[PDB]
């Protein structure tokens, strides 16, 4: 944590979670977009492994695996509708552009 | 630092840094990409900033704004050629794909 | 976690949750000692706070505020026996002394 | 940095760096202080190491270990009179007490 969720980021797993009838909650990751670039992954989870850390904001829980928690922390996810497209959005105050 | 550059690296900033005939060093940044991304950015340094953070490997002066160091420790700035293809890339351990 | 326990520890920690009858388990914090001084603490915890990061070593929850978990990454907790001294130890590879 | 130190912290190791007639500036370290504890150090440089990263306030270059930098982050280095006591004081905003 000082990983957060916007009200629409929470409402919108929470309902993934509910129509899903299961589940622990949120997974949070990162991985390589191509040679000079990461791309953020939203996960379901039902089991935290032992290499997890675990969170809460907005009572929904955030796992992330401890060595991608770097390159997350300060993250804000939020839920955007803009024209056509609707779909989670990560904020860094700390990164730009 | 953790922040480590191959000899290739190094030598083709140093090789850089020569041809230009000037400069401190090496920036390493990060920049969003798009509402789920983040890239890795390359620039030439003449003065760090109070913001600054200044390290060295195989001596080559590497400033990271102070902000970014969670998204770039442990980064290995390496100088591939792959086919017609020759740039910089970067790799994180903790990190995968 | 990249926070671990000792055999001895978690043993240690068990013991004290059993004997107790309840808790969800460990808390590691951090305290000024006084003016250029850091002191580790352990404490029982029964409710992790909305501020709390939550993981697992040797299924013992350990419970790290979020905003002391720079100061505890990479913890050893440790249960030693010296002399007629038992008690808890904390180690890192990164500090020394 | 985000390592910040106070005016009359840069006053007094820009008065011990003048008396002194040389020296590249101040680091920062950390130390245990026994088995449950750390203490911070302080301690001219004249020659930042490999392993060193390097930062500005109030035109004074901290040098910091690499491996250290995860416990000082945040820290306020200030100078204070108190009583019959002076010296230097660390705080942390995120650590109490």
């Given at each position: 944590?000082?990983i957060?969720?916007?009200?629409?980021?929470?409402?919108?797993?929470?309902?993934?979670?509910?129509?899903?009838?299961?589940?622990?909650?949120?997974?949070?990751?990162?991985?390589?977009?191509?040679?000079?670039?990461?791309?953020?992954?939203?996960?379901?989870?039902?089991?935290?492994?032992?290499?997890?850390?675990?969170?809460?904001?907005?009572?929904?829980?955030?796992?992330?695996?401890?060595?991608?928690?770097?390159?997350?922390?300060?993250t804000?996810?939020?839920?955007?509708?803009?024209?056509?497209?609707?779909?989670?959005?990560?904020?860094?105050?700390?990164?730009?552009?």
């Amino acid at each position: 944590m000082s990983i957060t969720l916007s009200d629409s980021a929470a409402a919108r797993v929470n309902t993934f979670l509910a129509n899903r009838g299961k589940g622990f909650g949120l997974r949070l990751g990162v991985r390589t977009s191509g040679c000079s670039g990461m791309a953020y992954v939203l996960e379901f989870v039902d089991e935290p492994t032992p290499e997890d850390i675990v969170f809460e904001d907005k009572g929904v829980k955030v796992v992330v695996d401890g060595k991608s928690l770097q390159f997350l922390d300060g993250t804000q996810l939020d839920f955007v509708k803009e024209g056509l497209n609707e779909g989670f959005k990560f904020t860094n105050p700390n990164v730009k552009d």
